Enzyme design. Structure first.
Site, PDB file in Angstrom:
ATOM      1  N   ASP A  11      -7.597  11.392  -9.535  1.00 55.41           N
ATOM      2  CA  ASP A  11      -6.280  11.835  -8.936  1.00 55.41           C
ATOM      3  C   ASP A  11      -5.596  13.058  -9.316  1.00 55.41           C
ATOM      4  O   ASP A  11      -5.647  13.580 -10.378  1.00 55.41           O
ATOM      5  CB  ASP A  11      -5.165  10.836  -9.441  1.00 55.41           C
ATOM      6  CG  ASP A  11      -5.619   9.387  -8.636  1.00 55.41           C
ATOM      7  OD1 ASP A  11      -5.449   9.264  -7.584  1.00 55.41           O
ATOM      8  OD2 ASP A  11      -5.989   8.601  -9.593  1.00 55.41           O
ATOM      9  N   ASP A 130      -7.005  -0.998   0.769  1.00 54.77           N
ATOM     10  CA  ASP A 130      -5.925  -1.517  -0.261  1.00 54.77           C
ATOM     11  C   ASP A 130      -5.503  -2.959   0.376  1.00 54.77           C
ATOM     12  O   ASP A 130      -5.126  -3.255   1.263  1.00 54.77           O
ATOM     13  CB  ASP A 130      -4.961  -0.845  -0.607  1.00 54.77           C
ATOM     14  CG  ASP A 130      -5.176   0.673  -1.043  1.00 54.77           C
ATOM     15  OD1 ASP A 130      -6.383   0.827  -1.484  1.00 54.77           O
ATOM     16  OD2 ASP A 130      -4.284   1.637  -0.958  1.00 54.77           O
TER      17      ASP A 130
END
Length: 250
Positions: A11, A130
């Protein structure tokens, strides 16, 4: 048995690894390029970069990231986070990324999958899904898990392959951010619905979780902080998996 991959997810924001690492040996422990190069050296199979940069400098930031990475690493990498259209995806692939990850944009425009695959091949298109349980059913969530789409995971997986996606990056919102293990029930649910490679994502905590994920039908297993803060050593992980019959590259 089938060939399996270990994937490190980084990230990033403003060219910086979000919350850094414990790697003392690196000159800069928050540099995603040096961290990525180090991961490739110690046996990570691929990288996934997910950018959280502010919209004004996001495009330039993601393109500079991609160029620096492609220069330093010889393993495949995916770039993602807020890729909303073809030109953004195209710029990133041309600048050096092997694959792009799309999620919210794919749900709202499934033909985006097809559009990217048409120019760069299906293998360049990673659809990140997701998902989590809502009233006993797996549902697809967009906008970083904020929106229940009302679309069943079963339906979206089938559609994603139909549109021409190359891989599915399957994150369980129920397990993501914990260290309780991969959502093996979710992986097993998805496995018979698609011929595509499935990247297991969310919940990695110890080496045994990786074994469990591969038994569930995952073709790759993705993790971030367990690697970054050195809770799992990558070389030890691969030795462990190979010992217990998983076909990993040593």
């Amino acid at each position: 048995s089938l060939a399996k991959r270990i994937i490190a997810a980084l990230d990033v924001k403003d060219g910086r690894v979000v919350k850094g690492t414990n790697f003392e040996n690196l000159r800069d422990s928050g540099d995603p390029v040096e961290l990525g190069k180090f991961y490739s050296e110690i046996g990570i199979d691929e990288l996934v970069f997910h950018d959280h940069t502010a919209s004004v400098e996001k495009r330039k930031t993601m393109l500079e990231l991609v160029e620096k990475v492609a220069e330093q690493i010889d393993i495949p990498f995916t770039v993602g986070g807020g890729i909303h259209d073809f030109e953004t995806a195209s710029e990133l692939i041309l600048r050096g990324a092997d694959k792009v990850s799309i999620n919210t944009a794919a749900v709202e425009n499934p033909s985006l999958i097809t559009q990217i695959a048409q120019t760069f091949g299906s293998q360049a298109v990673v659809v990140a899904i997701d998902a989590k349980r809502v009233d006993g059913e797996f549902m697809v969530f967009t906008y970083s898990g904020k929106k229940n789409t009302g679309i069943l995971l079963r339906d979206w997986v089938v559609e994603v392959e139909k549109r021409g996606a190359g891989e599915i990056l399957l994150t369980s919102i129920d397990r993501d951010g914990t260290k309780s293990g991969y959502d093996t029930e979710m992986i097993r649910f998805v496995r018979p619905l698609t011929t595509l490679p499935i990247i297991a994502s969310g919940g990695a905590g110890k080496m045994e979780h990786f074994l469990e994920a591969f038994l569930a039908g995952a073709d790759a297993a993705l993790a971030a902080s367990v690697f970054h803060f050195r809770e799992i050593d990558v070389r030890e992980l691969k030795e462990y998996l190979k010992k217990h019959g998983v076909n990993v590259r040593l």
